[PDB]
């Protein structure tokens, strides 16, 4: 025990030791080269209503028209954001949920929460209705998000300190991720769905391989657990959001951090983050009931979108960049231009 | 109008949904939901069955009200990232042995003890009243003939009867509290012969909803 | 997916008739039905529509104040009543399924009809042709012709062309002027530009032989054409 963990602290050291060896400079000391965005003002252009409890998640499709949102009463909503039209609503078995998603290819929806099960619904019958396709078990601790990567495979994360890859028409799993050591928060699929990353309780983040299953890297620098995570739109970055008032801006081939947005006002956590095209902006909720805009290159600017009345839960960015909607703890979805 | 006539059937169907949503919440705005919490060996399992993995949840009905009861024991997590989603609950039922007074795990009252007053005075729960189990008093009643309270309670300067000791541990339980202007403690010797349990439990819940109501016409 | 009616036969003038259908495999409280007619030897004309809930409710021009629509969810059941016929009502009718929400599928099942034998401001569509000979292995072009524009505002165009095989039903090809229909073999299109559309067929095969229609949907009533014959 005592060589094999001084082992590990002399590796631990050469990891430190090639991480600093070639930080020769930083983002604020070239970015001084771009003008400012400016003063960024949006408006509330629909107002979408109909939940009745708090809202936890929702998931945009990808041909920016049609929407997916889950809330604490049972229920699981399908809009038209165009002209604010329900198209499905899904009920549900179990009303503790926590998570949703919309699949790719416009045929599937996947949700799960305090039950320990994800259960996915086929949209396209031949009678008309709504029905649950496929019930995946096999966690034992509750489930934080699903993300499809095509028809047939899904990835869910507990928990139990565990990620899994599910083969939905088998039933079974096929890769299991481990190595964690606190309860894992939230994943995001890269854009050439060859690996992902994960955030956990314990202050840290990992990159995996998806058909392999070995962790490849891990990064730290958090002062408290982690809450979101996202990849920037070329798959080669990514931004964490934690609960001590700050995000962070990582670099996979530097192999440590880039950036922190913080200010001082702030004092509470962050709950969701996500970026936009040309990835110069950055959107982040807050508990302070509202929201806030960073530019990613700068990160000493904002806008603030304010107008919901509870902390905002989730927000979400299309495909072609032309709107934004957020949802938050009082039951009513808004879409901003 | 300016939309063609498929579009106006799209509004029809929007409306039709809209519907059965409100019908639909207003329905599940009229049962009483209870949260079940104890300890290890706590003897819940019994005020689990008198009274009529993942989450569990039981139902049942008692003089024309429904009640459901979340049972959470099985989750193996810490409770920070998921007790906020029981906040608009309308009691706790929580559940305690008097039998385990001198065992060791330091003591099993005492680490209780830190548990009760631990979700006694959350942020979540200042307005949600607690109602309170004292189980197995039969054991704890042929025990107290061979130890003396002493062995837990070193201050304790009474008789070595029942009684006594009974009211001495439920007043150490009822001091926990730091709002007594906003939420009540209700207790009760449990009582594993008949169903006066649920008259218990019946009677608090009318109580709360009754000062509920006052409170809320500013009255 | 079952549609089974009754109520046919031979009807002296005057009289009245209350014909039925019967839905079973199906959600039959979410789709929106229509009754349509087929003359013996002509083409095809809308009858009557009656919409989810029960709420609307649209008659053609020659029926209204005789011909009564009703339905009945608990039992999956569509009536028509009708009453005070007359010799220019001796036809076949059929009983047609249809679902209105972003993205959906109308006109996509329809029954099989019965038979019934007694002893403007509109929108004119016309198929030029009546019949064409050709040989299987070559490809075919049809077209028809509209009498207004049919393009809407938000980016819709509301044509449909429908196939008839000798001693059967219809079936639906394409909906909505340019998309493919569920089932239905990856070699037929349709496209076409204000008032004038085509279809056209490749590689065509044995049991592709019989009539198509085009229909319009842009506002009621609905409108079928003359009737096209391919041999």
């Known amino acids: 025990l005592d060589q094999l963990r001084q082992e590990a602290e002399q590796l631990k050291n050469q990891i430190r030791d090639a991480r600093k060896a070639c930080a020769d400079a930083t983002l604020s000391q070239i970015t001084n080269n771009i003008d400012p965005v400016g003063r960024i003002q949006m408006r509330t252009r629909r107002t979408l209503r109909g939940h009745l409890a708090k809202i936890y998640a929702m998931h945009w499709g990808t041909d920016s028209r049609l929407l997916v949102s889950a809330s604490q009463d049972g229920k699981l909503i399908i809009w038209d954001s165009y002209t604010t039209n329900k198209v499905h609503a899904i009920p549900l078995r179990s009303s503790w949920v926590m998570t949703c998603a919309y699949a790719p290819s416009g045929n599937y929806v996947a949700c799960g929460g305090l039950d320990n099960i994800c259960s996915i619904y086929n949209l396209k019958t031949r009678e008309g209705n709504v029905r649950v396709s496929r019930e995946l078990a096999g966690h034992t601790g509750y489930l934080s998000c699903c993300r499809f990567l095509d028809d047939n495979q899904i990835v869910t994360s507990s928990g139990d300190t565990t990620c899994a890859l599910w083969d939905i028409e088998t039933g079974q799993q096929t890769t299991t991720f481990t190595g964690h050591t606190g309860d894992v928060m939230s994943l995001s699929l890269a854009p050439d769905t060859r690996l992902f990353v994960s955030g956990a309780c314990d202050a840290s983040a990992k990159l995996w391989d998806v058909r392999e299953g070995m962790c490849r890297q891990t990064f730290t620098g958090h002062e408290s657990d982690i809450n979101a995570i996202c990849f920037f739109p070329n798959g080669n970055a990514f931004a964490t959001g934690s609960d001590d008032a700050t995000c962070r801006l990582f670099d996979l081939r530097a192999d440590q951090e880039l950036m922190t947005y913080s200010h001082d006002n702030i004092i509470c956590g962050i709950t969701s983050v996500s970026f936009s095209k040309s990835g110069r902006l950055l959107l982040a909720g807050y508990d302070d009931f509202n929201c806030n805009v960073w530019d990613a290159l700068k990160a000493d600017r904002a806008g603030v979108l304010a107008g919901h009345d509870n902390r905002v839960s989730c927000l979400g960015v299309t495909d072609d960049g032309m709107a934004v909607a957020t949802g938050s703890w009082d039951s009513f979805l808004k879409i901003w231009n | 109008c300016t939309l063609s006539a498929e579009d106006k059937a799209a509004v029809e169907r929007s409306k039709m949904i809209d519907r059965n949503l409100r019908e639909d919440g207003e329905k599940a705005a009229r049962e009483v939901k209870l949260l079940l919490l104890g300890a290890g060996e706590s003897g819940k399992s019994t005020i689990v069955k008198q009274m009529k993995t993942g989450i569990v949840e039981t139902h049942f009905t008692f003089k024309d009200l429904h009640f459901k009861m979340f049972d959470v024991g099985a989750q193996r997590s810490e409770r920070k990232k998921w007790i906020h989603c029981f906040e608009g609950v309308t009691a706790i039922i929580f559940c305690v042995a008097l039998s385990d007074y001198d065992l060791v795990l330091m003591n099993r009252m005492h680490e209780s003890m830190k548990l009760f007053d631990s979700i006694c005075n959350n942020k979540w729960f200042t307005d949600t009243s607690i109602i309170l189990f004292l189980n197995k008093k039969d054991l704890f009643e042929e025990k107290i003939k061979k130890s003396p309270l002493t062995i837990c309670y070193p201050e304790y300067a009474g008789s070595n009867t029942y009684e006594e000791a009974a009211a001495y541990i439920q007043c150490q339980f009822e001091d926990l509290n730091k709002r007594k202007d906003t939420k009540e403690i209700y207790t009760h010797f449990t009582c594993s012969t008949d169903t006066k349990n649920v008259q218990f439990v019946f009677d608090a819940v009318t109580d709360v909803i009754i000062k509920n109501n006052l409170k809320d016409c500013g009255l | 997916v079952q549609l089974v009616e009754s109520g046919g036969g031979l009807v002296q003038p005057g009289g009245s008739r209350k014909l039925s259908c019967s839905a079973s495999g199906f959600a039959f409280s979410s789709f929106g039905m229509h009754w349509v007619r087929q003359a013996p030897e002509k083409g095809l004309e809308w009858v009557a529509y009656i919409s989810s809930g029960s709420g609307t409710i649209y008659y053609a021009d020659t029926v209204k104040g005789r011909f009564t629509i009703s339905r009945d969810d608990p039992k999956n059941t569509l009536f028509l009543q009708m009453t005070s016929l007359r010799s220019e009502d001796t036809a076949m009718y059929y009983c047609?399924?249809?679902?209105?929400?972003?993205?959906?599928?109308?006109?996509?099942?329809w029954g099989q009809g019965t038979t019934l034998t007694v002893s403007s401001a509109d929108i004119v569509m016309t198929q030029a042709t009546s019949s064409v000979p050709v040989t299987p292995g070559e490809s075919v072009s049809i077209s028809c012709r509209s009498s207004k524009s049919l393009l809407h505002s938000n980016g819709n165009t509301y044509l449909y062309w429908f196939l008839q095989r000798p001693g059967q039903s219809p079936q639906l090809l394409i909906y909505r002027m340019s998309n493919l229909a569920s089932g239905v073999p990856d070699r037929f299109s349709g496209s076409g530009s204000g008032t004038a559309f085509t279809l056209t067929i490749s590689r065509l095969e044995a049991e592709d032989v019989g009539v198509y229609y085009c229909?319009?949907?842009?506002?009621?009533?609905?409108?079928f054409g003359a009737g096209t014959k391919l041999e």
């Open positions: 229909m319009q949907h842009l506002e009621y009533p609905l409108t």
């Open positions: 047609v399924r249809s679902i209105y929400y972003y993205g959906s599928s109308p006109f996509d099942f």
